């Protein structure tokens, strides 16, 4: 199947409370493998998967240097950006940056991404072709102009099509037992009379990986899109995910309803009935 390597960066200015807070995290698919906290004691890039720990001192020195440079870059950006938006020095503001690559099932480049947000809003983003920028504001166009001038697109495209894909493959091999696994969902149903003339059917999927799953309720084969309560897929904390979907059904109609579970770890989609 397809895979992704993704880095997420958050910088939060805290006026009179110190240097901005900086948090970096890296994923391969739905597994975190690294982290940096500006407030942490190590002041290093740190492992958060066992398969990355086998990388040598060169890697960790290399990744600390680069992430410290990401942190500094955002420190300037925070100050620049408040200037661009004529904002005060006393308010706290947030810079977010995401970048990474997807590979298809053939393990060749599929997509690259680079997006940047000020105070939770699209600011500047690299376009699909990894050649051009999408600038939200006129301030973004000033960044757009800086970056076009410095040929950022070209430097970043090389990373996303090249280095990013190369390292994603190394991680998929080093972490083959964890990253190239599918944990099929453990499924069950519950029934709860919500009143005296209707009941709740809850369809459960537990211990699944990857996070991607489809839970649908049908009545006589007809999907019940607008009648389904559907929680956001959630982490178990052990590297697996959970989800449920619920319908409220008249008492006596239970058997008309089927839950359908679609997940990559399942040879066939599961049909579950009460």
């Amino acid at each position: 199947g397809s895979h992704s390597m993704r880095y997420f960066f958050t910088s939060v200015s805290r006026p009179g409370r110190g240097e901005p807070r900086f948090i970096a995290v890296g994923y391969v698919d739905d597994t975190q493998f690294v982290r940096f906290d500006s407030d942490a004691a190590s002041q290093r890039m740190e492992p958060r998967a066992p398969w990355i720990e086998q990388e040598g001192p060169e890697y960790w020195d290399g990744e600390t240097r680069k992430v410290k440079a990401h942190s500094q870059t955002h420190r300037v950006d925070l100050g620049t950006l408040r200037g661009y938006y004529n904002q005060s020095e006393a308010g706290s503001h947030t810079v977010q940056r995401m970048y990474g690559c997807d590979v298809g099932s053939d393990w060749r480049f599929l997509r690259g991404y680079h997006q940047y947000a000020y105070d939770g809003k699209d600011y500047i983003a690299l376009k699909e072709d990894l050649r051009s920028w999408t600038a939200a504001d006129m301030a973004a166009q000033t960044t757009k102009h800086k970056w076009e001038a410095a040929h950022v697109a070209e430097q970043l495209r090389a990373y996303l099509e090249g280095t990013c894909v190369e390292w994603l493959r190394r991680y998929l091999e080093n972490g083959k037992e964890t990253l190239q696994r599918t944990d099929a969902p453990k499924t069950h149903m519950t029934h709860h009379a919500v009143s005296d003339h209707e009941a709740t059917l809850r369809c459960w999927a537990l211990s699944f990986y990857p996070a991607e799953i489809t839970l649908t309720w049908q009545r006589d084969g007809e999907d019940q899109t607008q009648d389904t309560e559907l929680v956001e897929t959630r982490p178990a904390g052990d590297g697996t995910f959970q989800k449920w979907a619920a319908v409220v059904v008249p008492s006596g109609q239970e058997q008309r309803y089927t839950c359908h579970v679609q997940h990559e770890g399942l040879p066939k989609p599961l049909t579950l009935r009460w």
């Binding site: 880095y7 990744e63 680069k66 300037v76 950006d77 970048y99 500047i124 410095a150 430097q155 990373y159």
Partner: peptide, 9 residues
């Protein structure tokens, strides 16, 4: 591995 960041906004 991380991108070699260059260029502030």
């Amino acid at each position: 591995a991380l991108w070699e960041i260059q260029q502030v906004v």
